[PDB]
Amino acid sequence: TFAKIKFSAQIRLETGLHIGGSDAFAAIGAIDSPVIKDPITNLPIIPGSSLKGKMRTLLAKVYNEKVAEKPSDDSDILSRLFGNSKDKRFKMGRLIFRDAFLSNADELDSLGVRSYTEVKFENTIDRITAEANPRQIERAIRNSTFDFELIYEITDENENQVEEDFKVIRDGLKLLELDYLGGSGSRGYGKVAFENLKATTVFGNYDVKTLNELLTAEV
Amino acid sequence: MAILTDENYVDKAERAISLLEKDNKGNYLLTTSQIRKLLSLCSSLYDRSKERKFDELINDVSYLRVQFVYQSGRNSVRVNRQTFFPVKDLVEKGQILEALKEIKDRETLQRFCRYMEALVAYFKFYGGKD
Amino acid sequence: MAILTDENYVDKAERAISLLEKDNKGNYLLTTSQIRKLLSLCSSLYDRSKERKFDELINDVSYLRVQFVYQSGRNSVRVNRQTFFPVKDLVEKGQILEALKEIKDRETLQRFCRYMEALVAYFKFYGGKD
Amino acid sequence: MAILTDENYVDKAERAISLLEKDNKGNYLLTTSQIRKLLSLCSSLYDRSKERKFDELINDVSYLRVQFVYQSGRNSVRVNRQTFFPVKDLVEKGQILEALKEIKDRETLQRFCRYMEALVAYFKFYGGKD
RNA sequence: ACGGAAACCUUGAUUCUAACGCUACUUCUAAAUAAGCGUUA
InterPro entries of this UniProt entry (chains B, C, D) (predicted)? Predict the structure, then answer.
């Protein structure tokens, strides 16, 4: 009864995103906080490690029933979905995250932008001396959309657990919507939305009609 | 006859920025903040020259040229009752506008953007400030 | 006369690393993360020099020189109310720029890349940090 | 005075291996995987020394020395809240760095390679894991 | 006009089959592009 179901969505930013990388592709005269970029196209990306880590940390506050000092100390419902290196049962998880790449660069160009990353100028103001220290932070453009792909596998170990894993995936995406993807999101960064969130059985035989109903209705 | 070639642009940037105006204390009058927008536009133009054809990037070079002229005309530093214009000094001593006039395809555009890379690199090398 | 030869470059790195600036605690001011891009560019240039001739490696060598002079001035550490340039100190004490100016063929390019490898090897051998 | 002669290098390796530092459990902190590249380079140098003259082997000896110091400075193990450098310790107690400087012909090179083989044999004989 | 002459230690054989350098990990944490308008008239 092996099957694979692909949750495909559009991560549309509601605010500039700063996931943050190194100076490997930074400009030669830029005192910036660079974002993680594609090596070839030099476009901003959303790495699957960021999505997986943020979603796992968010779902650890809702689906654990016990505070976990480590990802290995996570509950079974999350270990079987995200993986557990200290559990022979759950060493390989059922979720594959994928790097998300910019998918509406043409629309952004037609909207009249000159680059797909902007530089936001902030400062910290001393509260005793009124002395301002400025910073520059690179962000992806607000109306950017990224192709989001998440592959969920079904084997005989998913005999009576698929309807719960589907709910956990929906809850993780929703929690990501009521949170921020990695960055300085406490100052209003990294707000995202999942658009056209649908599930397609890309391998095997499986019925995703009900799941797609809660995807496109509850979201 | 081109002022920028693959064998001289780094040394050309060397000489161009070693001649920039200096204060009586020896510090450069130019700062990276005065040329930040120009550097960003050059970086974006270099990035976009790899994918798209040169005929698509015909407005970007013109915007880059008008930005160069505007920044050279607007940036002023006043010290000791004397006003200098460091971006204009950099533009004339590096022949930025003349090099921009010799941009006709991907190769010349990429050479100019690498020349700007070399200019800011060596500006930072000799004590340029942010 | 050439400063990098097959008999002296390892001892040259030996002598250059020992003279680098240190804090009052005795540890180095330079870190590997400051020279990571330069090491990557040198490694890529050395790898690509084996398979292709030096005639069309000129842009890679010029960009390597540009990145060296940029990272020299970019990286600054402020310790005990005093600014230091560790990458600039390493470049000036290892004669990186003068060794780069001597690159004219594949043999000299590979010698320079091996010298850079020797420099980072001896930097890590003497307790240099990442 | 030559530290490595044809009469005592095996005993030198024996004493060196006996002097290597161990863990709280008596296990060797050095592993063969930490020195695998060094051993491969030593074997290739020994194989090439039989036919090729020492003139073209000097670059290989220099790179071998660079690899020795890099692995001395790179490999570190943290156990019981204390850090150690197994390759650096092996190099110091085995007296390898200045044993490399006396490599002046084929005989000294082969002496050093046999010394390294003896070091590996006695390191494995005393519980050295892979 | 020698215990000597003549005589291949030779023919045929794959150091081969199986095996993911893999499992877990948010480039993260706080931070108003902001403060000062004197003195002469």
Answer: CRISPR-assoc_prot_Csm2_III-A
